[PDB]
């Protein structure tokens, strides 16, 4: 964990596009990551930031960081409903199918927020709809308990 | 009534004494403390709810009592923050003049009846109402130096023997422990516990079980049969009192017979309550206790009583055990009253030397000598009649008002001396005509003052507690330096003064005093002749008094504005922030750090360092802590290099430097009851239900405005803290279901476990003690430990934790307020170096008015005293301004002439404003203090000039030009006489340094050259103000 | 109810004396706590 570093965690999750435009051009560590095992790139997909994570991406950050529970961006940006953010990770090579530690998927999380159009680009790009996780639940039965009548017939 | 004793001069001595006597009395029964109440009177409930994170006390705690804060009288506003060190504070507080007992039982009250509807475990743990406004009197702390004993020993050890006996005495209002006795503590393995199927549910059982208070009965109790022979009482179980009781604890018998002990599965033994804080003193453990001073009581008394209990239990310490004292408000009380006795003596050396000087003789001396001590001891007797205590204020306003005292006296002496002089009449004639020539102005002057002073005491809230400390010690010593003057000095003149021959001016006198006269009245004549010179060309002068006039508004608008000037207090503070995160160890590191600086490189100055380590004012956690710096006596730190502000200014420059931590040395608040008023004191509040992410959002988006206006708005920042990653776990209900676990026993073992639970109480040597079981250090540290856990599931099967759970990162807050029930984040900042508070406010309504839909806001604490503060002043000012007149009115039979002696006013101001500008000081309360009495002293000069000059227009007739030369003439000396003792008494408050010399400064400087100017000025310029005024009227 | 002389001192009449300090015009306190597990504590003020 470096100064430049710290820096960048902060700027990245308050959403300070010029700070970040200037840490960028000065080499902050990208790859920066907190105790937790957030990455700028975790921070700007939780809290929201679209240009942030355009230019991390630009910047060679890993799209596929994974915190110290298994969680990537693509995890974050799917469950709190920042579809841009979730288009731009996915076309930048995001693990559509990754599972963290709980073997939750991108999938299971939109599902259960109730993320109608990101649940459908998740599928576009590919994501396993049989998906289980360690309870052996898949985004459907999410669906289904919730009381997601819409979302149910999406998955059929 | 002057009359009346000068042929009564030992009734005049009887009322004399018995003033005296009054004011002896008073001083016998009279509070003494540092400060009166100045802060509105504010209550805090306080509650805690071990293991919970911020947002589980807000909503389970906080709102509940919330909503139940109705029907309580005289309520300002009500403020609370919920944190994740599992508590809440909710401060109420109360319009200034509410009574305190009265709001703290009404608080009380309406708390009790929410007390149902809490958590079982926070009205377990109890919640506290406290008057919270109130200040130390003393810290002591208590540390151990041989290393024998830790934090815990040592505050179990205080609280034992030595807590109780402090509160017991004489004056000892409140006394809080820092730190707890002992707690029993149980440290649970989740190992061991699961490798004989328990889990903490079980642990908590048996103790219940197997630690507690069984009634039980009588033989032979009534009703009884008869013929009975023996009644008495039957004991049963009574509660554990020992760790190897509590380890003894059964838990389990199994098949092969043998024995599962609670030991067996635990770490047992006496320790903290809780483990928040590492306080340390100078790097060694510390507890302490802090106290505060009864109503009415003695500051001093108690101080001396508090360190004579002390000493008869110090030979009952433990070895190592030591007392010490980081903070103690007592020298400061002392310092004030031996400053009042100080410049009692030396004013009255002053005036004797002054007055021998000029009138060179010792019985005109005496008179005045006589006088100041008669008129000082009956303030002290009105002082106590109003209510008022001794301290610091009242004593400031004391030596003030001793300086004003003297005027009276060397006043009435001078006139007869005069009349003496020129008419050759015996003391007691010329005692009787005297009289009727300076009463009127002896009586407008102490109008004047009255008429200043007393409607500044009508400011409300904290301005006005301050204010009228000065307004009722200077007001009541007017009244009575009147009085005094009125009946004692008369009768003494005309029993003690010795004849003086008709024109025996002492000019054929010898050696110096006949080289003085000569010199004096040839000055004189020279100073005549001037203002004849002068008035003959009064055109110029008003020309000249208009630059003056507007040379004081340029400076008054110049000079920055402030609340309350900086002190060296003998303490100071120490910031410690890591980021969010950051463990209780890392910061000890740099606590360290601050303390082995401070040991090290400021060694000649600094007495101590008391680190707590997990303590702020605004925030606690792990990640914060501050270091409290105390320093050895002002005396052995000589010099400007050694004050809190240099030492201050070095130990935030050296801190920079360092690691991933934030820093920094400053100052107390002047006044620490009252606490910082500085800036302003925002609150962003959510009014619709927009919740805690929306609201940080609308936060930042003002604060990026603020941060847009430097020129206006300088430093403004969350007062709270941000939020930060926590460990969210989900409990799956299907799958704890099918397995048959139970949600109690699943959550009541990680929380016992994690959180740690408050079981009962045990007793140990005879005082009552909680249980708390709790995981070991080395199973609840990281997310992989969570798996380790075992619950037994309905089947008796041990199922472990990562069965029927998940989890995942998500940030939340550490620290949750809300103001007036809702919702809020407080905000501070100040105004731009240049600019107005007042202005800077405006601009923040004017960038909270473009915040998103449902964000509103609101004015609290200083800002709220403020708002209602300056919306009060220019009718108060408009009060005085029209009474000062409407005295003058009546003293002069005329509604013009009053303007010869309100015009003065700016001839004292200039120099106050002139003398502040040059030291480069600023307009806070002690130099409005200074100002006001600047406007009474420029008063006082003009009134004797106009007073003589129209007396003698309307009783000899003379001419407008004959009789202001002749006014000024006889005026002149006593006007020297005056302003020369009062500028050299005055003069130390000048130059101090230390020790509450930020005040003294303050209105040392307006004060003095206020005098300077006031009578350099107006000498020359009320003759011209009496004759243009009577020219054009 | 139930609790000893001792008992009902140890666990209630000290801590509740131990937060008695400090009340205005208070001359002197007294208490007694009981076999039956009744405390008193009486607390008597200045004349005024
Ligand atoms: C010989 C010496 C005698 C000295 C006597 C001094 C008397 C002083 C009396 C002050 C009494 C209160 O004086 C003051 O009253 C005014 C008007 O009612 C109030 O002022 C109120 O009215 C003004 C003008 O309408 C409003 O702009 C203001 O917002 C409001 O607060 C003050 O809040 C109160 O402090
Ligand atoms: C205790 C502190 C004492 C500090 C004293 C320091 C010096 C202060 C000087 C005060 C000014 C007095 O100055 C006084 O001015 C007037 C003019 O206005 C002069 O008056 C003379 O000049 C003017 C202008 O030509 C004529 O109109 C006037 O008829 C003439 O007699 C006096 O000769 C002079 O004495």
């Known amino acids: 964990g470096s100064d430049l570093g710290k820096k960048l965690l902060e700027a990245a999750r308050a959403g300070r596009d010029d700070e970040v435009r200037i840490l960028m051009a000065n080499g902050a560590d990208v790859n920066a990551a907190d105790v937790v095992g957030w990455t700028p790139l975790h921070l700007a997909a939780y809290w929201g930031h679209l240009e ?35 288009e731009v990770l996915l076309k930048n090579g995001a693990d559509v199918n990754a599972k963290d530690d709980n073997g939750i998927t991108p999938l299971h999380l939109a599902a259960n927020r109730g993320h109608l159009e990101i649940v459908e680009v998740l599928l576009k790009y590919g994501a396993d709809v049989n998906a289980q996780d360690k309870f052996g639940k898949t985004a459907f039965d999410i669906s289904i308990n919730n009381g997601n009548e819409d979302l149910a017939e999406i998955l059929q | 009534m002057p009359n009346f004793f000068i042929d009564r001069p030992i009734f005049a001595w009887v009322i004399a004494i018995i003033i005296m006597l009054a004011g002896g009395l008073a001083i016998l029964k009279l509070p003494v403390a540092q400060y009166p109440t100045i802060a509105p009177p504010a209550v805090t409930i306080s509650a805690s709810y071990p293991g919970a994170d911020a947002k589980t006390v807000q909503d389970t705690v906080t709102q509940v009592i919330e909503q139940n804060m109705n029907g309580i009288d005289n309520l300002m506003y009500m403020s609370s923050n919920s944190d994740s060190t599992g508590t809440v504070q909710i401060t109420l507080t109360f319009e200034s003049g509410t009574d305190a007992d009265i709001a703290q039982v009404q608080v009380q009250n309406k708390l009790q009846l929410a007390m149902p509807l809490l958590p079982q475990e926070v009205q377990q743990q109890g919640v506290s109402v406290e008057k919270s406004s109130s200040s130390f009197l003393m ?10 004993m830790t934090q815990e020993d040592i505050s179990d050890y205080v609280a034992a023997n030595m807590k109780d006996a402090i509160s017991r005495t004489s004056g000892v209002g409140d006394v809080q422990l820092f730190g707890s006795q002992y707690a029993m503590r149980i440290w649970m393995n989740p190992n061991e516990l699961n490798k004989f199927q328990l889990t903490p549910v079980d642990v908590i059982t048996a103790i219940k079980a197997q630690n507690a208070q069984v009634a ?30 509590f380890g003894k604890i059964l838990l389990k018998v199994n098949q092969d017979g043998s024995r599962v002990l609670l030991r067996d599965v635990a770490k047992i033994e006496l320790g903290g309550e809780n483990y928040d804080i590492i306080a340390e003193f100078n790097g060694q453990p510390a507890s302490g206790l802090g106290i505060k001073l009864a109503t009415g009581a003695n500051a001093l008394d108690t101080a001396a009583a508090i360190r004579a209990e002390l000493a008869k239990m110090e030979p009952f310490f433990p070895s190592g055990l030591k007392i010490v004292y980081p903070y103690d408000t007592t020298p400061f009380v002392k310092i004030s009253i031996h400053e009042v006795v100080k410049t009692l003596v030396e004013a009255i050396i002053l005036v004797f030397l002054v007055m021998y000087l000029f009138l060179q003789n010792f019985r005109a001396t005496l008179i005045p000598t006589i006088a100041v001590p008669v008129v000082l001891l009956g303030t002290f007797a009105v002082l106590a009649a109003f209510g008022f205590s001794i301290n610091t204020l009242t004593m400031f306003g004391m030596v003030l008002a001793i300086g004003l005292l003297v005027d009276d006296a060397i006043v009435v002496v001078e006139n007869v001396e005069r009349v003496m002089a020129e008419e050759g009449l015996p003391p007691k004639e010329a005692t009787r005509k005297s009289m009727g020539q300076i009463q009127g102005a002896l009586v407008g002057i102490a109008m004047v003052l009255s008429a200043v002073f007393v ?4 400011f409300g809230g904290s301005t006005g507690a301050i204010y009228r400390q000065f307004s009722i010690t200077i007001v009541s010593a007017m009244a009575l330096s009147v009085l005094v003057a009125l009946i004692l000095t008369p009768a003494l003149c005309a029993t003690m003064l010795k004849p003086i021959a008709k024109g025996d001016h002492g000019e054929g006198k010898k050696g110096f005093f006949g080289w003085f006269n000569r010199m004096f009245e040839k000055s004189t004549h020279h100073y005549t002749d001037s203002v004849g010179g002068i008035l003959r060309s009064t055109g110029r002068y008003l020309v000249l008094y208009l630059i003056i006039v507007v040379g004081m508004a340029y400076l008054f608008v110049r000079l920055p504005s402030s609340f309350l000037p900086d002190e060296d207090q003998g303490v100071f503070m120490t910031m410690v922030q890591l980021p969010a995160g950051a463990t209780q160890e890392r910061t000890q590191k740099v606590l360290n750090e601050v303390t082995h600086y401070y040991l090290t490189k400021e060694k000649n100055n600094v007495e101590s360092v008391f680190a707590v380590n997990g303590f702020g004012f605004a925030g606690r956690g792990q990640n914060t802590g501050i270091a409290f710096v105390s320093l050895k006596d002002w005396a052995d730190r000589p010099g400007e290099e050694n004050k809190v502000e240099a030492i201050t200014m070095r130990a935030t420059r050296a801190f920079s430097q360092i690691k991933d931590a934030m820093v920094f040395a400053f100052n107390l608040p002047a006044i620490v009851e009252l606490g910082t008023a500085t800036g302003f004191d925002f609150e962003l509040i959510d009014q619709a239900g927009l919740g805690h992410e929306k609201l940080t959002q609308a936060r930042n988006q003002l604060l990026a405005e603020a941060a847009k206006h430097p020129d206006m708005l300088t430093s403004v920042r969350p007062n709270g803290l941000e939020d930060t990653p926590q460990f969210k776990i989900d409990i799956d209900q299907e799958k704890a279901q099918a397995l048959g676990v139970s949600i109690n026993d699943i959550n009541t073992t990680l929380g016992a476990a994690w959180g740690g639970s408050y079981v009962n109480d045990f007793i140990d040597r005879g005082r009552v003690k909680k249980v708390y079981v709790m995981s070991e250090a080395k199973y609840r540290m990281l997310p992989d430990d969570i798996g380790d856990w075992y619950v037994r599931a309905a089947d008796g099967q041990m199922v472990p934790f990562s069965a029927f759970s998940s989890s995942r990162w998500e940030y939340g807050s550490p620290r949750l307020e809300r103001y007036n029930g809702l919702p809020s984040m407080e905000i501070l900042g100040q105004a731009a170096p240049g600019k107005s508070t007042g202005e800077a406010m405006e601009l923040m309504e004017q960038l909270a008015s473009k915040l998103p839909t449902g964000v509103g806001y609101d004015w609290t604490g200083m800002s709220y005293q403020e708002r209602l503060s300056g919306n009060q002043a220019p009718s108060l000012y408009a009060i005085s301004l029209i009474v000062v007149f409407l005295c003058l009115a009546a003293l002069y039979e005329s509604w013009s002439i009053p303007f010869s002696v309100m015009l003065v006013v700016p001839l004292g101001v200039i120099g106050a404003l002139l003398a502040a500008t040059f030291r480069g000081l600023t307009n806070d309360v002690y130099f409005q203090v200074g100002l006001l009495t600047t406007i009474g002293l420029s008063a006082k000069n003009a009134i004797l000039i106009v007073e003589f000059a129209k007396d003698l227009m309307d009783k000899e007739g003379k001419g407008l030009i004959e009789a202001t030369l002749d006014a000024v003439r006889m005026a002149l000396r006593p006007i020297l006489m005056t302003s020369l003792a009062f500028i050299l008494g005055v003069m130390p408050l000048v130059i101090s340094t230390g020790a509450g010399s930020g005040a003294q400064n303050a209105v040392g400087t307006g004060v003095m050259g206020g005098m300077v100017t006031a009578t350099v000025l107006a000498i020359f310029f009320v003759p011209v103000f009496f004759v243009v005024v009577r020219r054009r009227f």
């Open chain 2, 455 to 458: 409607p500044m005491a009508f």
């Open chain 1, 52 to 86: 942030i994570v355009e230019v991390l991406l630009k910047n060679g950050a890993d799209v596929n960081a994974y915190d110290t529970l298994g969680s990537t961006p693509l995890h974050l940006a799917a469950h709190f409903g920042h579809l841009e953010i979730v």
């Open chain 2, 216 to 245: 039980a009965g009588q033989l032979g109790g009534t009703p009884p049969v008869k013929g009975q022979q023996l009644n008495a009482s039957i004991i049963a179980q009574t509660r554990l009192t020992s760790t190897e009781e």
């Open chain 2, 139 to 148: 810290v002591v702390g208590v540390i151990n130096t041989d290393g024998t």
